[PDB]
């Protein structure tokens, strides 16, 4: 059997600023802007006490379910609209093994069950941090006050 | 205990000219060239009777692993050099959930055990069929004669 500890170890996953663990698997050798590359891809893991806190990306991000527990991805449009997609293998429910979280929204994510969860993420315009913006729980309760409950599950204070 | 039948059905997978089953998941709404797109992803399944026959792409292709049976990417460099990689979820052996099959190279894949295999494939500059190229067993035994053994599995005559 394989725990979360086995994946972080063998895959060499670093802690992530947004939450969970990660490690750039491959990066294009082609360029988009003489700044960013054509695509970037990582492994992304979530342990029980983990979550990927609300943050926004300047580009589209492809999600590939790799293993473990299924996830619920929470998204808030730039209009306050909250939607959700589930990633995984239980096709009976709205679970899909892939999903595209559209650039411009503020999304988070959590496992639908205790345990561990490993995914694969791919942002086309090569991910840089000037294309990343994490958010304060305050900054998120001010805008979108209607989503107190959820904005507390995917955001820490200050 | 899902099986290949559930996947092909729920994900609506139709035969691929190169073999196996597939269905585009998402394409990138952003353009790369006036011709192709920034990116594209498709699902791709493999059953005990199917293998992905040697073919060549114009762009790189990322491979994600959703579930099923570890595969094996057989690649042949333009200089006639056969390399292999183990896609899958067993970290004990050299299995890795993601793999990058470099463009300009002729490759194919088979499963490792009988069963099924759902896989994620992301080719960067939008996969147009101009960037594709399937090969006959003929040409493959001509060029690269020292690899007949595997050419007789991931290829077919006439």
TrEMBL record, chains A, B:
Higher taxonomy = Bacteria, Pseudomonadati, Pseudomonadota, Gammaproteobacteria, Alteromonadales
Where would I find the DUF985 domain in this sequence? 6-135
Q: Could you tell me which species this protein originates from? A: Shewanella oneidensis (strain ATCC 700550 / JCM 31522 / CIP 106686 / LMG 19005 / NCIMB 14063 / MR-1)
According to UniProt, the name of this protein is: DUF985 domain-containing protein
Looking up InterPro entries in the UniProt record yields:
Cupin_DUF985, RmlC-like_jellyroll, RmlC_Cupin_sf, YML079W-like
Task: Name the coiled-coil region(s).
Answer: none
Which Gene3D superfamilies does the record match to this protein? Jelly Rolls (2.60.120.10)
Q: Which domain of life is it from?
A: Bacteria
